[PDB]
């Protein structure tokens, strides 16, 4: 259906893990972004309550980056919890299986969230096992009606080919940007927007280098 | 040298409220001296849960966070669940060798045991996992982790598992109960069963637990 809209077509992936620095950065640099990826490296040392925070902190949309990886019961458990503390959207592995997808989308149904299905991994491991399994884990997201995805800016042909198979109308989303080698302008060839982590927080300014990642987009 | 686990029996705590979860692991305290703590109870009540639990019963915690991110998120997570005070961490294979190594990277720093899952229970996991379940603990093997999570709900796959990692591995196994699994079947191949609802849903979960230990007093 009708995919969600991302400003500047850029999300800031949260992974600093002490909440004053976590609040400080992503307040430097909420000019230019709405939709915070939040995962476990905050959320295990600050508590869920971080993502209700982040919410009514600075108004903006936030995906639970979760990697949801378990059998049906417990995924359908992890789901509630998460969207249950304010969550819009929730990450889940498909490596596990259409039914441990279909838990989550049942979920995200039931509460009006969104799940995204992360088809492929940008690290070097993710060719022992994930990328053999890639093109058939987007097309059962496909044929399950899974409208959102996450795909590696470190492997642009693959990244191409994922877009592919999903269509234009899905939303695609791609980590890897910066730090692990990614380009900005190059992923967005196929991205609907880019995910950066530490290229933006561990920089001396995180402003300028947010800025001057959409200066290099515009 | 591998843990040894109690009874041969780990609680899979999956209540999602900490009065709940407390009042169940104290009916089953004698029973178990180890607990397999998940996401749904953690997400729902805080990280501070795993240091309460090891206070209250003295037992030791597996967190069961089936780890399955790029290595510097997975140290992240690693560290921030030992700091916690989790005894073992368990951690997906199928994002590869880097992914583990930076599990271990870190267990090894903080004295604490990582375990490797490399193939599931439910029916999902012939999709994908199934396929690459051997080659997942051949690579634990090679890089030398200890402990292993594999399947009660196939005996023969959990049995090849078991002709994988060899004797010295200790190897713990779910999806007994709720899932279908035996008790005794399974112990034939790993050196513990995990068991969440039907104890921790059972109208009496002492005499569930106590029922499972009789059924098994034999091994
Ligand atoms: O394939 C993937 C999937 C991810 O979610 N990620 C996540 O995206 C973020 C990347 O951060 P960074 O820009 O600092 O490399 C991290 O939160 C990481 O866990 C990734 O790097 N690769
Ligand atoms: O392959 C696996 C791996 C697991 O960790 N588990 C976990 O083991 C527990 C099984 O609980 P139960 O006995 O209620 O089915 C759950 O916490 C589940 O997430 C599983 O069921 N299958």
Known sequence: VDVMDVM???????????????????????????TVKIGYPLVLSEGMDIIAEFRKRFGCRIIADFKVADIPETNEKICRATFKAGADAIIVHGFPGADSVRACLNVAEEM????????????????MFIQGAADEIARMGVDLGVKNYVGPSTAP????????????????ISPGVGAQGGDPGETLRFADAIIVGASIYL?????????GIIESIK
């Open 157 to 172: 042909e693959r990244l191409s080919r994922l877009r592919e198979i999903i269509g234009q109308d899905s939303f695609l």
């Open 112 to 127: 009006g969230r969104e799940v995204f299905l992360l088809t492929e991994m940008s690290h070097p491991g993710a060719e």
């Open 203 to 211: 920089a001396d300014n995180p402003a300028a280098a947010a800025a």
């Open 8 to 34: 500047n077509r850029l999300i800031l992936a949260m992974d600093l893990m002490n909440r004053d620095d976590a609040l400080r950065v992503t307040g430097e640099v909420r000019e230019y972004i709405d």
